[PDB]
Amino acid sequence: NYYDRSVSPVEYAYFDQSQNMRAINWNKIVDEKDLEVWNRVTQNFWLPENIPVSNDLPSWNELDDDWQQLITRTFTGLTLLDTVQSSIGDVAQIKNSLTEQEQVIYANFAFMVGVHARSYGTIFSTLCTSEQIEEAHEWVVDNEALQARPKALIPFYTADDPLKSKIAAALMPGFLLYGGFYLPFYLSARGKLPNTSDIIRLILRDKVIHNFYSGYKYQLKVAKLSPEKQAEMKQFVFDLLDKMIGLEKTYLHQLYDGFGLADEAIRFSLYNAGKFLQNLGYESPFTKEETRIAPEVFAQLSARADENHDFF
Protein backbone atom coordinates (compact mmCIF):
# COMPACT_ATOMS: atom_id res chain seq x y z
CA ASN A 1 0.00 0.00 0.00
CA TYR A 2 2.89 2.49 0.61
CA TYR A 3 3.42 2.67 -3.19
CA ASP A 4 -0.20 3.68 -3.91
CA ARG A 5 -0.15 6.57 -1.37
CA SER A 6 3.25 8.04 -2.34
CA VAL A 7 5.03 9.49 -5.39
CA SER A 8 8.56 9.26 -6.83
CA PRO A 9 10.74 12.35 -6.19
CA VAL A 10 10.54 13.49 -9.84
CA GLU A 11 6.70 13.43 -9.65
CA TYR A 12 6.93 15.43 -6.40
CA ALA A 13 9.34 17.97 -7.95
CA TYR A 14 7.30 18.70 -11.09
CA PHE A 15 3.67 17.43 -10.85
CA ASP A 16 2.11 16.55 -7.47
CA GLN A 17 3.03 17.24 -3.83
CA SER A 18 -0.17 15.96 -2.14
CA GLN A 19 1.74 12.86 -0.89
CA ASN A 20 5.22 12.11 0.47
CA MET A 21 8.08 10.66 -1.58
CA ARG A 22 8.99 6.97 -1.92
CA ALA A 23 12.50 5.62 -2.52
CA ILE A 24 13.01 3.49 -5.66
CA ASN A 25 12.08 -0.16 -5.00
CA TRP A 26 14.23 -2.61 -7.00
CA ASN A 27 12.90 -5.59 -4.98
CA LYS A 28 9.28 -5.36 -6.19
CA ILE A 29 9.32 -4.27 -9.83
CA VAL A 30 6.19 -3.00 -11.65
CA ASP A 31 7.39 -3.98 -15.15
CA GLU A 32 9.79 -6.91 -15.71
CA LYS A 33 10.81 -5.36 -19.08
CA ASP A 34 12.55 -2.52 -17.15
CA LEU A 35 14.82 -4.95 -15.28
CA GLU A 36 15.55 -6.75 -18.58
CA VAL A 37 16.49 -3.46 -20.29
CA TRP A 38 18.50 -2.22 -17.27
CA ASN A 39 20.52 -5.44 -17.20
CA ARG A 40 21.11 -5.42 -20.98
CA VAL A 41 22.35 -1.78 -21.24
CA THR A 42 24.52 -1.92 -18.07
CA GLN A 43 26.08 -5.25 -19.17
CA ASN A 44 26.71 -3.63 -22.60
CA PHE A 45 28.79 -0.78 -21.06
CA TRP A 46 31.81 0.12 -23.19
CA LEU A 47 34.31 2.94 -23.73
CA PRO A 48 35.91 3.91 -27.08
CA GLU A 49 39.55 3.72 -25.86
CA ASN A 50 39.30 -0.12 -25.78
CA ILE A 51 38.89 -0.34 -29.60
CA PRO A 52 42.15 -0.16 -31.64
CA VAL A 53 41.33 2.68 -34.08
CA SER A 54 45.04 3.04 -35.08
CA ASN A 55 44.69 -0.09 -37.29
CA ASP A 56 42.45 1.99 -39.64
CA LEU A 57 45.40 4.30 -40.51
CA PRO A 58 46.46 2.26 -43.59
CA SER A 59 42.96 2.27 -45.19
CA TRP A 60 42.32 5.88 -44.04
CA ASN A 61 45.52 7.03 -45.81
CA GLU A 62 44.42 5.46 -49.15
CA LEU A 63 41.27 7.66 -49.14
CA ASP A 64 41.64 11.08 -50.84
CA ASP A 65 41.04 14.42 -49.06
CA ASP A 66 37.41 14.69 -50.26
CA TRP A 67 36.53 11.25 -48.81
CA GLN A 68 38.35 12.06 -45.54
CA GLN A 69 36.50 15.40 -45.35
CA LEU A 70 33.14 13.64 -45.96
CA ILE A 71 33.78 11.12 -43.16
CA THR A 72 34.87 13.84 -40.69
CA ARG A 73 31.85 16.04 -41.61
CA THR A 74 29.33 13.17 -41.50
CA PHE A 75 30.62 11.99 -38.09
CA THR A 76 30.64 15.55 -36.65
CA GLY A 77 26.98 15.84 -37.75
CA LEU A 78 26.23 12.56 -35.93
CA THR A 79 28.07 13.96 -32.89
CA LEU A 80 25.68 16.96 -32.90
CA LEU A 81 22.65 14.66 -32.82
CA ASP A 82 24.10 12.63 -29.92
CA THR A 83 24.85 15.89 -28.05
CA VAL A 84 21.15 16.86 -28.47
CA GLN A 85 19.97 13.46 -27.18
CA SER A 86 22.47 13.31 -24.26
CA SER A 87 21.99 16.84 -22.93
CA ILE A 88 18.24 17.35 -23.69
CA GLY A 89 16.34 14.43 -25.25
CA ASP A 90 16.91 11.44 -22.98
CA VAL A 91 17.01 13.46 -19.74
CA ALA A 92 13.64 15.10 -20.62
CA GLN A 93 12.08 11.60 -20.59
CA ILE A 94 12.91 11.00 -16.90
CA LYS A 95 10.03 13.04 -15.39
CA ASN A 96 7.46 11.45 -17.78
CA SER A 97 8.32 7.85 -16.79
CA LEU A 98 5.62 5.25 -16.10
CA THR A 99 7.88 3.39 -13.64
CA GLU A 100 10.71 4.10 -11.19
CA GLN A 101 13.28 1.95 -13.04
CA GLU A 102 12.51 3.76 -16.32
CA GLN A 103 13.71 7.01 -14.67
CA VAL A 104 17.14 5.39 -14.09
CA ILE A 105 17.19 3.72 -17.53
CA TYR A 106 16.84 7.12 -19.28
CA ALA A 107 19.69 8.43 -17.10
CA ASN A 108 21.79 5.53 -18.46
CA PHE A 109 20.66 6.36 -22.04
CA ALA A 110 21.71 10.01 -21.67
CA PHE A 111 25.15 8.95 -20.37
CA MET A 112 25.68 6.29 -23.08
CA VAL A 113 24.71 8.64 -25.94
CA GLY A 114 27.37 10.87 -24.34
CA VAL A 115 29.84 7.99 -24.79
CA HIS A 116 28.69 7.64 -28.43
CA ALA A 117 29.56 11.31 -29.00
CA ARG A 118 32.88 10.73 -27.14
CA SER A 119 33.75 7.81 -29.47
CA TYR A 120 33.68 10.01 -32.62
CA GLY A 121 36.20 12.21 -30.82
CA THR A 122 38.53 9.21 -30.35
CA ILE A 123 38.19 8.35 -34.07
CA PHE A 124 39.06 11.95 -35.05
CA SER A 125 42.00 12.01 -32.61
CA THR A 126 43.57 8.95 -34.27
CA LEU A 127 42.76 9.58 -37.96
CA CYS A 128 42.11 13.30 -38.59
CA THR A 129 44.29 16.42 -38.64
CA SER A 130 43.54 19.47 -36.47
CA GLU A 131 42.44 21.35 -39.62
CA GLN A 132 40.04 18.56 -40.69
CA ILE A 133 38.42 18.50 -37.21
CA GLU A 134 38.01 22.31 -37.09
CA GLU A 135 36.65 22.48 -40.69
CA ALA A 136 33.97 19.89 -39.84
CA HIS A 137 32.80 21.86 -36.77
CA GLU A 138 32.62 25.05 -38.90
CA TRP A 139 30.72 23.10 -41.56
CA VAL A 140 28.17 21.71 -39.04
CA VAL A 141 27.49 25.17 -37.54
CA ASP A 142 26.89 26.76 -40.98
CA ASN A 143 24.94 23.88 -42.60
CA GLU A 144 21.27 24.97 -42.44
CA ALA A 145 20.02 21.63 -43.87
CA LEU A 146 21.88 19.72 -41.12
CA GLN A 147 20.71 22.15 -38.39
CA ALA A 148 17.03 21.98 -39.45
CA ARG A 149 16.70 18.37 -38.23
CA PRO A 150 17.51 18.81 -34.49
CA LYS A 151 15.80 22.24 -34.64
CA ALA A 152 12.53 20.44 -35.55
CA LEU A 153 12.76 17.93 -32.65
CA ILE A 154 14.12 20.06 -29.74
CA PRO A 155 10.86 22.05 -29.17
CA PHE A 156 9.05 18.77 -28.37
CA TYR A 157 11.55 18.06 -25.53
CA THR A 158 11.06 21.50 -23.90
CA ALA A 159 7.24 21.60 -24.28
CA ASP A 160 4.71 19.90 -21.94
CA ASP A 161 3.32 17.09 -24.17
CA PRO A 162 5.02 13.87 -22.91
CA LEU A 163 3.95 11.66 -25.85
CA LYS A 164 5.28 14.13 -28.45
CA SER A 165 8.57 14.34 -26.51
CA LYS A 166 8.75 10.52 -26.42
CA ILE A 167 8.17 10.30 -30.20
CA ALA A 168 10.85 12.94 -30.82
CA ALA A 169 13.19 11.03 -28.46
CA ALA A 170 12.70 7.74 -30.37
CA LEU A 171 12.97 9.47 -33.77
CA MET A 172 16.66 10.25 -33.05
CA PRO A 173 18.15 6.73 -32.57
CA GLY A 174 15.37 5.08 -34.63
CA PHE A 175 15.69 7.19 -37.81
CA LEU A 176 17.81 10.36 -37.94
CA LEU A 177 21.35 8.91 -37.61
CA TYR A 178 20.91 6.10 -40.20
CA GLY A 179 21.52 8.44 -43.17
CA GLY A 180 24.94 9.05 -41.62
CA PHE A 181 25.52 5.42 -40.54
CA TYR A 182 25.23 4.40 -44.22
CA LEU A 183 28.75 5.82 -44.83
CA PRO A 184 30.84 3.65 -42.44
CA PHE A 185 28.91 0.53 -43.57
CA TYR A 186 29.41 1.52 -47.24
CA LEU A 187 33.14 1.91 -46.45
CA SER A 188 33.62 -1.31 -44.41
CA ALA A 189 31.82 -3.32 -47.14
CA ARG A 190 34.74 -2.27 -49.41
CA GLY A 191 37.35 -3.13 -46.71
CA LYS A 192 37.81 0.51 -45.60
CA LEU A 193 38.03 1.57 -41.91
CA PRO A 194 37.09 -1.81 -40.31
CA ASN A 195 37.85 -0.79 -36.69
CA THR A 196 35.70 2.36 -37.04
CA SER A 197 32.72 0.13 -38.05
CA ASP A 198 33.25 -1.85 -34.79
CA ILE A 199 32.65 1.41 -32.86
CA ILE A 200 29.55 2.06 -35.03
CA ARG A 201 28.17 -1.44 -34.25
CA LEU A 202 28.65 -0.82 -30.48
CA ILE A 203 26.83 2.52 -30.81
CA LEU A 204 24.05 0.77 -32.75
CA ARG A 205 23.80 -2.00 -30.07
CA ASP A 206 22.77 0.78 -27.65
CA LYS A 207 20.63 2.88 -30.06
CA VAL A 208 18.57 -0.14 -31.18
CA ILE A 209 17.57 -0.68 -27.51
CA HIS A 210 16.99 3.08 -26.98
CA ASN A 211 14.54 3.13 -29.90
CA PHE A 212 12.77 -0.10 -28.82
CA TYR A 213 12.42 1.09 -25.23
CA SER A 214 10.97 4.52 -26.05
CA GLY A 215 8.63 2.87 -28.58
CA TYR A 216 7.59 0.31 -25.94
CA LYS A 217 6.81 3.05 -23.39
CA TYR A 218 5.02 5.10 -26.06
CA GLN A 219 2.70 2.18 -26.90
CA LEU A 220 1.89 1.57 -23.21
CA LYS A 221 0.87 5.23 -22.70
CA VAL A 222 -1.14 5.73 -25.92
CA ALA A 223 -2.99 2.43 -25.29
CA LYS A 224 -4.68 4.13 -22.29
CA LEU A 225 -5.95 7.07 -24.41
CA SER A 226 -9.35 7.36 -26.09
CA PRO A 227 -9.66 6.18 -29.73
CA GLU A 228 -9.96 9.86 -30.78
CA LYS A 229 -6.71 10.77 -28.99
CA GLN A 230 -4.97 7.65 -30.37
CA ALA A 231 -5.98 8.75 -33.90
CA GLU A 232 -4.62 12.27 -33.18
CA MET A 233 -1.26 10.84 -32.05
CA LYS A 234 -1.06 8.49 -35.06
CA GLN A 235 -1.60 11.52 -37.34
CA PHE A 236 1.12 13.48 -35.48
CA VAL A 237 3.67 10.63 -35.81
CA PHE A 238 3.20 10.31 -39.60
CA ASP A 239 3.09 14.12 -40.05
CA LEU A 240 6.32 14.54 -38.05
CA LEU A 241 8.05 11.60 -39.79
CA ASP A 242 7.00 13.03 -43.20
CA LYS A 243 8.55 16.39 -42.22
CA MET A 244 11.74 14.75 -40.90
CA ILE A 245 12.12 12.66 -44.09
CA GLY A 246 11.86 15.87 -46.16
CA LEU A 247 14.59 17.55 -44.11
CA GLU A 248 16.74 14.40 -44.09
CA LYS A 249 16.53 14.02 -47.91
CA THR A 250 17.67 17.64 -48.37
CA TYR A 251 20.58 17.16 -45.93
CA LEU A 252 21.71 13.81 -47.42
CA HIS A 253 21.60 15.08 -51.04
CA GLN A 254 23.78 18.01 -49.90
CA LEU A 255 26.12 15.60 -48.06
CA TYR A 256 26.34 12.75 -50.63
CA ASP A 257 25.47 13.95 -54.21
CA GLY A 258 29.11 14.65 -55.16
CA PHE A 259 30.02 11.05 -54.21
CA GLY A 260 26.86 9.51 -55.74
CA LEU A 261 25.68 8.02 -52.42
CA ALA A 262 22.54 10.10 -51.65
CA ASP A 263 19.93 7.83 -53.29
CA GLU A 264 21.36 4.72 -51.55
CA ALA A 265 21.63 6.65 -48.25
CA ILE A 266 17.98 7.83 -48.54
CA ARG A 267 16.75 4.24 -49.16
CA PHE A 268 18.88 3.07 -46.19
CA SER A 269 17.23 5.85 -44.14
CA LEU A 270 13.66 5.00 -45.27
CA TYR A 271 14.20 1.31 -44.38
CA ASN A 272 14.86 2.43 -40.79
CA ALA A 273 11.92 4.90 -40.96
CA GLY A 274 9.72 1.83 -41.48
CA LYS A 275 11.30 0.12 -38.45
CA PHE A 276 10.77 3.30 -36.40
CA LEU A 277 7.02 3.12 -37.20
CA GLN A 278 6.88 -0.62 -36.38
CA ASN A 279 8.52 0.03 -32.99
CA LEU A 280 5.77 2.62 -32.25
CA GLY A 281 2.99 0.08 -33.11
CA TYR A 282 2.23 1.39 -36.64
CA GLU A 283 2.56 -0.18 -40.11
CA SER A 284 5.26 0.94 -42.55
CA PRO A 285 3.89 2.49 -45.79
CA PHE A 286 7.27 2.26 -47.61
CA THR A 287 7.74 -0.17 -50.52
CA LYS A 288 10.61 -2.65 -51.04
CA GLU A 289 11.76 -0.47 -53.98
CA GLU A 290 11.95 2.60 -51.70
CA THR A 291 13.77 0.75 -48.86
CA ARG A 292 16.21 -1.35 -50.95
CA ILE A 293 19.64 -1.78 -49.33
CA ALA A 294 22.51 -3.51 -51.16
CA PRO A 295 23.37 -6.96 -49.63
CA GLU A 296 26.99 -5.99 -48.80
CA VAL A 297 25.84 -2.85 -46.90
CA PHE A 298 23.03 -4.65 -45.02
CA ALA A 299 25.60 -7.28 -43.94
CA GLN A 300 27.69 -4.55 -42.25
CA LEU A 301 24.53 -3.05 -40.68
CA SER A 302 23.27 -6.35 -39.20
CA ALA A 303 26.67 -7.77 -38.10
CA ARG A 304 26.87 -8.51 -34.36
CA ALA A 305 28.82 -6.22 -32.01
CA ASP A 306 32.11 -7.69 -30.74
CA GLU A 307 31.83 -8.52 -27.01
CA ASN A 308 35.65 -8.40 -26.59
CA HIS A 309 35.28 -4.56 -26.61
CA ASP A 310 32.99 -4.64 -23.52
CA PHE A 311 34.20 -3.07 -20.25
CA PHE A 312 33.99 -6.39 -18.36
Add this chain to the structure above:
Amino acid sequence: NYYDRSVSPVEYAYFDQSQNMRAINWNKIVDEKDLEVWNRVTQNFWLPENIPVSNDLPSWNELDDDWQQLITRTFTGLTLLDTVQSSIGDVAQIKNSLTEQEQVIYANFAFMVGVHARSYGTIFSTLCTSEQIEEAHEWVVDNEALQARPKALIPFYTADDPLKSKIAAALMPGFLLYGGFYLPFYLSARGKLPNTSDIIRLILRDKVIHNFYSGYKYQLKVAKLSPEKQAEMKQFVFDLLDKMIGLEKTYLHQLYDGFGLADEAIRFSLYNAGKFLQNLGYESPFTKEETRIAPEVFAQLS
Protein backbone atom coordinates in the same frame (compact mmCIF):
# COMPACT_ATOMS: atom_id res chain seq x y z
CA ASN B 1 36.30 30.53 -34.29
CA TYR B 2 33.13 28.42 -34.90
CA TYR B 3 32.82 27.98 -31.10
CA ASP B 4 32.41 31.70 -30.32
CA ARG B 5 29.56 32.07 -32.90
CA SER B 6 27.57 28.93 -31.95
CA VAL B 7 25.90 27.41 -28.88
CA SER B 8 25.62 23.91 -27.44
CA PRO B 9 22.21 22.22 -27.95
CA VAL B 10 21.19 22.64 -24.30
CA GLU B 11 21.92 26.42 -24.56
CA TYR B 12 19.85 26.48 -27.75
CA ALA B 13 16.98 24.53 -26.14
CA TYR B 14 16.62 26.68 -22.98
CA PHE B 15 18.48 30.02 -23.32
CA ASP B 16 19.36 31.40 -26.79
CA GLN B 17 18.27 30.39 -30.33
CA SER B 18 19.94 33.32 -32.18
CA GLN B 19 22.94 31.19 -33.28
CA ASN B 20 23.27 27.67 -34.69
CA MET B 21 24.30 24.63 -32.65
CA ARG B 22 27.78 23.09 -32.35
CA ALA B 23 28.51 19.40 -31.74
CA ILE B 24 30.58 18.60 -28.63
CA ASN B 25 34.32 18.88 -29.39
CA TRP B 26 36.45 16.35 -27.45
CA ASN B 27 39.57 17.18 -29.56
CA LYS B 28 39.86 20.75 -28.26
CA ILE B 29 38.55 21.30 -24.72
CA VAL B 30 38.05 24.45 -22.61
CA ASP B 31 38.85 22.94 -19.17
CA GLU B 32 41.37 20.10 -18.75
CA LYS B 33 39.72 19.27 -15.37
CA ASP B 34 36.63 17.97 -17.21
CA LEU B 35 38.76 15.39 -19.06
CA GLU B 36 40.37 14.25 -15.78
CA VAL B 37 36.97 13.88 -14.07
CA TRP B 38 35.38 12.17 -17.12
CA ASN B 39 38.23 9.65 -17.28
CA ARG B 40 38.12 8.96 -13.53
CA VAL B 41 34.34 8.40 -13.19
CA THR B 42 34.08 6.30 -16.40
CA GLN B 43 37.10 4.15 -15.43
CA ASN B 44 35.50 3.70 -11.96
CA PHE B 45 32.34 2.13 -13.51
CA TRP B 46 30.99 -0.67 -11.30
CA LEU B 47 27.80 -2.69 -10.74
CA PRO B 48 26.58 -4.16 -7.39
CA GLU B 49 26.41 -7.74 -8.79
CA ASN B 50 30.25 -7.96 -8.78
CA ILE B 51 30.46 -7.70 -4.95
CA PRO B 52 29.78 -11.02 -3.14
CA VAL B 53 27.16 -9.68 -0.68
CA SER B 54 26.10 -13.29 0.10
CA ASN B 55 29.31 -13.60 2.20
CA ASP B 56 27.71 -11.16 4.72
CA LEU B 57 25.01 -13.76 5.59
CA PRO B 58 26.82 -15.13 8.69
CA SER B 59 27.31 -11.66 10.22
CA TRP B 60 23.77 -10.57 9.16
CA ASN B 61 22.47 -13.61 11.09
CA GLU B 62 24.52 -12.47 14.14
CA LEU B 63 22.43 -9.25 14.24
CA ASP B 64 18.99 -9.24 15.90
CA ASP B 65 15.90 -8.03 14.03
CA ASP B 66 16.06 -4.52 15.60
CA TRP B 67 19.55 -4.04 14.11
CA GLN B 68 18.36 -5.54 10.80
CA GLN B 69 15.38 -3.14 10.79
CA LEU B 70 17.73 -0.17 11.45
CA ILE B 71 20.03 -1.16 8.56
CA THR B 72 17.13 -1.63 6.12
CA ARG B 73 15.53 1.68 7.19
CA THR B 74 18.83 3.62 7.07
CA PHE B 75 19.65 2.30 3.57
CA THR B 76 16.11 2.87 2.21
CA GLY B 77 16.47 6.46 3.51
CA LEU B 78 19.74 6.75 1.55
CA THR B 79 17.96 5.22 -1.47
CA LEU B 80 15.44 8.12 -1.40
CA LEU B 81 18.23 10.71 -1.46
CA ASP B 82 19.97 8.93 -4.36
CA THR B 83 16.63 8.76 -6.22
CA VAL B 84 16.26 12.56 -5.80
CA GLN B 85 19.80 13.12 -7.10
CA SER B 86 19.58 10.68 -10.05
CA SER B 87 16.12 11.79 -11.26
CA ILE B 88 16.18 15.57 -10.48
CA GLY B 89 19.41 16.99 -9.03
CA ASP B 90 22.22 15.88 -11.35
CA VAL B 91 20.19 16.18 -14.57
CA ALA B 92 19.14 19.74 -13.54
CA GLN B 93 22.86 20.68 -13.59
CA ILE B 94 23.28 19.81 -17.30
CA LYS B 95 21.74 23.02 -18.74
CA ASN B 96 23.73 25.23 -16.30
CA SER B 97 27.13 23.81 -17.38
CA LEU B 98 30.15 26.06 -18.02
CA THR B 99 31.53 23.63 -20.62
CA GLU B 100 30.42 21.00 -23.13
CA GLN B 101 32.16 18.12 -21.29
CA GLU B 102 30.49 19.08 -18.00
CA GLN B 103 27.07 18.46 -19.64
CA VAL B 104 28.06 14.84 -20.33
CA ILE B 105 29.75 14.38 -16.91
CA TYR B 106 26.49 15.27 -15.10
CA ALA B 107 24.72 12.65 -17.27
CA ASN B 108 27.24 10.10 -15.95
CA PHE B 109 26.65 11.36 -12.37
CA ALA B 110 22.85 10.86 -12.64
CA PHE B 111 23.36 7.36 -14.04
CA MET B 112 25.90 6.37 -11.37
CA VAL B 113 23.80 7.71 -8.47
CA GLY B 114 21.10 5.49 -10.03
CA VAL B 115 23.53 2.56 -9.70
CA HIS B 116 24.13 3.56 -6.04
CA ALA B 117 20.39 3.39 -5.31
CA ARG B 118 20.24 0.06 -7.18
CA SER B 119 23.07 -1.41 -5.05
CA TYR B 120 20.97 -1.02 -1.86
CA GLY B 121 18.31 -3.11 -3.58
CA THR B 122 20.97 -5.78 -4.24
CA ILE B 123 21.92 -5.75 -0.54
CA PHE B 124 18.23 -6.03 0.44
CA SER B 125 17.56 -8.86 -2.03
CA THR B 126 20.60 -10.75 -0.66
CA LEU B 127 19.88 -10.36 3.08
CA CYS B 128 16.39 -9.01 3.88
CA THR B 129 12.94 -10.60 3.83
CA SER B 130 10.22 -9.07 1.61
CA GLU B 131 8.46 -7.82 4.77
CA GLN B 132 11.63 -6.13 6.10
CA ILE B 133 11.96 -4.40 2.70
CA GLU B 134 8.30 -3.26 2.62
CA GLU B 135 8.35 -2.02 6.25
CA ALA B 136 11.37 0.19 5.45
CA HIS B 137 9.55 1.72 2.44
CA GLU B 138 6.47 2.43 4.60
CA TRP B 139 8.72 3.96 7.25
CA VAL B 140 10.48 6.22 4.70
CA VAL B 141 7.15 7.51 3.30
CA ASP B 142 5.68 8.23 6.77
CA ASN B 143 8.86 9.74 8.34
CA GLU B 144 8.30 13.51 8.31
CA ALA B 145 11.81 14.24 9.70
CA LEU B 146 13.40 12.19 6.89
CA GLN B 147 11.17 13.80 4.23
CA ALA B 148 11.96 17.39 5.39
CA ARG B 149 15.55 17.14 4.06
CA PRO B 150 14.88 16.46 0.34
CA LYS B 151 11.76 18.70 0.54
CA ALA B 152 13.98 21.67 1.55
CA LEU B 153 16.47 21.17 -1.34
CA ILE B 154 14.22 20.12 -4.29
CA PRO B 155 12.90 23.72 -4.82
CA PHE B 156 16.43 24.85 -5.79
CA TYR B 157 16.56 22.29 -8.63
CA THR B 158 13.18 23.41 -10.07
CA ALA B 159 13.89 27.16 -9.57
CA ASP B 160 15.69 29.63 -11.89
CA ASP B 161 18.97 30.24 -9.92
CA PRO B 162 21.91 28.10 -11.26
CA LEU B 163 24.16 28.74 -8.22
CA LYS B 164 21.52 27.79 -5.63
CA SER B 165 20.75 24.66 -7.71
CA LYS B 166 24.50 23.85 -7.76
CA ILE B 167 24.83 24.29 -3.96
CA ALA B 168 21.86 21.94 -3.41
CA ALA B 169 23.42 19.44 -5.86
CA ALA B 170 26.68 19.47 -3.82
CA LEU B 171 24.94 19.33 -0.40
CA MET B 172 23.45 15.81 -0.98
CA PRO B 173 26.68 13.87 -1.88
CA GLY B 174 28.81 16.24 0.25
CA PHE B 175 26.78 16.13 3.49
CA LEU B 176 23.29 14.58 3.76
CA LEU B 177 24.12 10.88 3.24
CA TYR B 178 27.04 10.67 5.73
CA GLY B 179 24.73 10.30 8.77
CA GLY B 180 23.52 7.06 7.18
CA PHE B 181 27.00 6.00 6.01
CA TYR B 182 28.14 6.04 9.66
CA LEU B 183 26.14 2.81 10.27
CA PRO B 184 27.88 0.35 7.86
CA PHE B 185 31.34 1.65 8.88
CA TYR B 186 30.43 1.40 12.59
CA LEU B 187 29.37 -2.19 11.84
CA SER B 188 32.37 -3.24 9.66
CA ALA B 189 34.73 -1.77 12.29
CA ARG B 190 33.27 -4.57 14.50
CA GLY B 191 33.55 -7.21 11.71
CA LYS B 192 29.85 -7.06 10.70
CA LEU B 193 28.79 -6.92 7.02
CA PRO B 194 32.28 -6.43 5.46
CA ASN B 195 31.04 -6.94 1.85
CA THR B 196 28.28 -4.34 2.32
CA SER B 197 31.03 -1.89 3.36
CA ASP B 198 32.82 -2.59 0.05
CA ILE B 199 29.65 -1.44 -1.80
CA ILE B 200 29.55 1.63 0.47
CA ARG B 201 33.21 2.37 -0.41
CA LEU B 202 32.47 2.05 -4.16
CA ILE B 203 29.56 4.50 -3.69
CA LEU B 204 31.81 6.97 -1.80
CA ARG B 205 34.55 6.75 -4.46
CA ASP B 206 31.94 8.28 -6.81
CA LYS B 207 30.26 10.69 -4.39
CA VAL B 208 33.52 12.36 -3.28
CA ILE B 209 34.26 13.26 -6.94
CA HIS B 210 30.64 14.43 -7.42
CA ASN B 211 30.98 16.78 -4.42
CA PHE B 212 34.44 18.00 -5.53
CA TYR B 213 33.32 18.63 -9.11
CA SER B 214 30.11 20.51 -8.26
CA GLY B 215 32.08 22.55 -5.68
CA TYR B 216 34.77 23.28 -8.30
CA LYS B 217 32.19 24.52 -10.85
CA TYR B 218 30.41 26.60 -8.19
CA GLN B 219 33.71 28.35 -7.34
CA LEU B 220 34.41 29.23 -11.00
CA LYS B 221 30.96 30.83 -11.42
CA VAL B 222 30.89 32.74 -8.09
CA ALA B 223 34.40 34.17 -8.70
CA LYS B 224 32.96 36.12 -11.68
CA LEU B 225 30.33 37.84 -9.45
CA SER B 226 30.73 41.17 -7.64
CA PRO B 227 32.01 41.12 -4.00
CA GLU B 228 28.48 42.01 -2.77
CA LYS B 229 26.87 39.14 -4.72
CA GLN B 230 29.67 36.79 -3.58
CA ALA B 231 28.96 37.78 0.04
CA GLU B 232 25.23 37.21 -0.56
CA MET B 233 25.94 33.68 -1.88
CA LYS B 234 28.27 32.85 1.04
CA GLN B 235 25.48 33.97 3.40
CA PHE B 236 22.95 31.76 1.56
CA VAL B 237 25.28 28.72 1.85
CA PHE B 238 26.00 28.99 5.60
CA ASP B 239 22.30 29.72 6.31
CA LEU B 240 21.14 26.73 4.22
CA LEU B 241 23.75 24.41 5.78
CA ASP B 242 22.66 25.56 9.26
CA LYS B 243 19.05 24.59 8.42
CA MET B 244 20.08 21.25 6.89
CA ILE B 245 22.25 20.42 9.94
CA GLY B 246 19.18 21.14 12.12
CA LEU B 247 17.01 18.78 10.06
CA GLU B 248 19.72 16.08 9.91
CA LYS B 249 20.18 16.12 13.72
CA THR B 250 16.42 15.67 14.26
CA TYR B 251 16.37 12.84 11.69
CA LEU B 252 19.46 11.05 13.07
CA HIS B 253 18.19 11.22 16.67
CA GLN B 254 14.92 9.61 15.41
CA LEU B 255 16.68 7.06 13.14
CA TYR B 256 19.13 5.76 15.73
CA ASP B 257 16.46 5.80 18.51
CA GLY B 258 17.30 3.01 20.97
CA PHE B 259 20.83 2.34 19.62
CA GLY B 260 22.77 5.29 21.09
CA LEU B 261 24.56 6.06 17.79
CA ALA B 262 23.10 9.53 17.08
CA ASP B 263 25.75 11.73 18.75
CA GLU B 264 28.59 9.88 16.98
CA ALA B 265 26.69 9.91 13.65
CA ILE B 266 26.08 13.68 14.01
CA ARG B 267 29.82 14.26 14.63
CA PHE B 268 30.59 12.09 11.58
CA SER B 269 28.05 14.18 9.63
CA LEU B 270 29.56 17.53 10.74
CA TYR B 271 33.07 16.38 9.74
CA ASN B 272 31.69 16.03 6.19
CA ALA B 273 29.77 19.33 6.49
CA GLY B 274 33.18 20.98 6.95
CA LYS B 275 34.58 19.17 3.90
CA PHE B 276 31.48 20.23 1.92
CA LEU B 277 32.23 23.90 2.79
CA GLN B 278 35.90 23.42 1.82
CA ASN B 279 34.87 22.04 -1.60
CA LEU B 280 32.82 25.26 -2.11
CA GLY B 281 35.87 27.46 -1.26
CA TYR B 282 34.80 28.42 2.30
CA GLU B 283 36.32 27.65 5.72
CA SER B 284 34.88 25.13 8.17
CA PRO B 285 33.61 26.70 11.45
CA PHE B 286 33.27 23.31 13.23
CA THR B 287 35.52 22.37 16.16
CA LYS B 288 37.68 19.25 16.52
CA GLU B 289 35.35 18.17 19.35
CA GLU B 290 32.26 18.68 17.14
CA THR B 291 33.68 16.54 14.28
CA ARG B 292 35.44 13.74 16.26
CA ILE B 293 35.38 10.30 14.57
CA ALA B 294 36.68 7.13 16.27
CA PRO B 295 39.87 5.71 14.63
CA GLU B 296 38.24 2.32 13.84
CA VAL B 297 35.33 4.06 12.04
CA PHE B 298 37.70 6.46 10.21
CA ALA B 299 39.79 3.42 9.12
CA GLN B 300 36.75 2.06 7.22
CA LEU B 301 36.99 5.22 5.08
CA SER B 302 39.76 3.32 3.15
